[PDB]
Design a protein around this ligand. Sequence first.
Ligand SMILES: *[C@@H]1O[C@H](CO)[C@@H](O[C@@H]2O[C@H](CO)[C@@H](O[C@@H]3O[C@H](CO)[C@@H](O)[C@H](O)[C@@H]3O)[C@H](O)[C@H]2NC(C)=O)[C@H](O)[C@H]1NC(C)=O
Ligand SMILES: *[C@@H]1O[C@H](CO)[C@@H](O[C@@H]2O[C@H](CO)[C@@H](O[C@@H]3O[C@H](CO)[C@@H](O)[C@H](O)[C@@H]3O)[C@H](O)[C@H]2NC(C)=O)[C@H](O)[C@H]1NC(C)=O
Lengths: 331, 333
Amino acid sequence: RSVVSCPANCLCASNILSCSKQQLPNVPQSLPSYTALLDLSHNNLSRLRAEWTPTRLTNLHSLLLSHNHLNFISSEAFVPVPNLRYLDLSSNHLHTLDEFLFSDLQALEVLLLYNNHIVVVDRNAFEDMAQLQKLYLSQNQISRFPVELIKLPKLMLLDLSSNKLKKLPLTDLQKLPAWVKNGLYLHNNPLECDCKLYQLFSHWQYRQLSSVMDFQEDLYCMHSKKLHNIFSLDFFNCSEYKESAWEAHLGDTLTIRCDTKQQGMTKVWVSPSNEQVLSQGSNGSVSVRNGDLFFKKVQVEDGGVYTCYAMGETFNETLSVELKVYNFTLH
Amino acid sequence: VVSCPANCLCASNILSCSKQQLPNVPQSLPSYTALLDLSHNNLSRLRAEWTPTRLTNLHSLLLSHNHLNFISSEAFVPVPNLRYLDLSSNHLHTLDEFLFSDLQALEVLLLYNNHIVVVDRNAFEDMAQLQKLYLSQNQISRFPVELIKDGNKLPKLMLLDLSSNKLKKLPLTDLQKLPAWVKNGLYLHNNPLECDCKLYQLFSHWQYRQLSSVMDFQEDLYCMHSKKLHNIFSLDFFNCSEYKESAWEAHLGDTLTIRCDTKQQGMTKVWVSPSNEQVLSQGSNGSVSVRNGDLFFKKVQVEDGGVYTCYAMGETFNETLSVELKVYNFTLH
Ligand SMILES: *[C@@H]1O[C@H](CO)[C@@H](O[C@@H]2O[C@H](CO)[C@@H](O[C@@H]3O[C@H](CO)[C@@H](O)[C@H](O)[C@@H]3O)[C@H](O)[C@H]2NC(C)=O)[C@H](O)[C@H]1NC(C)=O
Ligand SMILES: *[C@@H]1O[C@H](CO)[C@@H](O[C@@H]2O[C@H](CO)[C@@H](O[C@@H]3O[C@H](CO)[C@@H](O)[C@H](O)[C@@H]3O)[C@H](O)[C@H]2NC(C)=O)[C@H](O)[C@H]1NC(C)=O
């Protein structure tokens, strides 16, 4: 009749436990160690306690806890689930993400935290999360941009839409790889209206980043109250947006990235002499490392426009960078 | 922050539209949608035009806990790049031919806890990427051997959950021939299987191999003969012979391939010879070569006899598999 290992209030489909919409105030007892996906959504959990599971769950890859009343998560809550890849904590009552809260989840690739009551995000909430690619933080009350996350090595989607962001670290945002910008969602926030902000988003629009293209109508700033679509604002003394032009001193060591929109594309660099920059030796001058331009000791004769021809499955990109070599220092 | 359809929460590329007792799918679904959650609603039909838009960015479609009793033969035309589809806990009664054939990138299909009585092999035709199919808690009485039998198999299917159905008979000779990586995810527990010794011998082997399909569910692997339930692993007590290993016998000059029959794909295989030397190579007179990850004898010699060991190395576990070769000093042709 019933599966012996199946906890109360669950439908057990081999390694899937469907325990949703069961009015549960606590996690079912005696969860089996073979569990791969635990769906506890639409319940009435308020605390994810230390020892919510006395056993393992070394096989657990997905934990779904959305639509509960979670307002507390133990500092020990993720010790039992080391191999977790996907965690849905959306639609809960979470308010503050303490230091080291998710730091045990070193295999996690997706974290959903949208539609909570989050007012504070600690600088160390996500420390050690090396595998994390997507972090959804929409529909909260976050007012401090989590600058530490972009100053998470694999993070390629950071959704901070529908929050209380006003001030942005624009210089940090400018230096971000285009593959991160592509998934950095800042729509539906009372951002400060500013020429530099227009310039940031206008660049992203030129590059056709999804973050802008998908949400153009929702990209707001706010000036003395009011709220305006950023692209509706014509700023005085505000230039179009600057082409990419590294400046170096004679003798510098320097790496220049091919700033593609998406990872894993095929990159070929062509020098200003119209020669292919080769990956080969450890001698000088210019070479390609990892897919970036590398100059061991920049010379006057280096410099000019280098072009990276990048090829993907769905699109290509042609990105130019001007190296300007200065024969003097101004300090 | 809309573009957001009426009864949905839109979090960039995620639409969460669950538990709103919707009788139809929200209108004007945005093309940027990556995951669409319409679970715990009142949908009864997934019609040809559930989405006029076309959701080429959709990878997950969650439709569990609805009242779905009908899916259009064109329902999956708009979601060509779908990887994960949950149709569990619905009222689905038949799996019509070619029903999922538009889902050529689908990796996981959940159909557990429905009213499915009969599985048509053609419902899953051309699903080249389908890795996991969950069909537990239905009323299935015939084992769909065509899903996994060499000839017309789904090539990447590595988990087939048929637990908690109405299975009485299995195609045991067909199941024995399967690679252990398929057997490892073939779940047959909590079915009224007829007790017989061939049944015991199959599961006895799987148990010795520590396949998850057995190790995780030993207590739910039961059989009926007669109207009383027995645990399959009690059949040794009833005088059934244990699992019989294991030849292998060759004649001089034979050409022979021996698989390292590991329970997970993608493991590194290292073969060692009866003389305790690594096999190696692919030249290859003649006389131990390793090809793909298989032991290969182009022309068996009497010196080639003995026990060969395959050490298989994976991320989470390792296996050691031994095969004994016996060589006759003559050839019958
Ligand atoms: C979801 O779980 C919570 C936590 O148990 C439930 O909240 C609790 O609801 C009960 C009413 O069912 C409240 O009981 C009352 O408590 C006060 C003292 O606090 C007492 O004076 C009353 O006589 C009464 O017994 C309880 O306060 C409340 N606890 C909390 C922390 O809010 C909730 O009902 C559960 N929801 C469902 C619908 O399953
Ligand atoms: C969403 O789907 C659920 C399906 O369960 C609907 O709930 C069901 O609603 C019907 C009424 O439409 C309820 O039936 C009633 O039963 C009583 C007593 O026998 C009878 O006097 C009424 O005339 C009617 O037949 C039924 O109890 C209820 N089922 C459950 C499980 O709660 C719900 O109506 C649907 N929502 C929408 C918005 O369509």
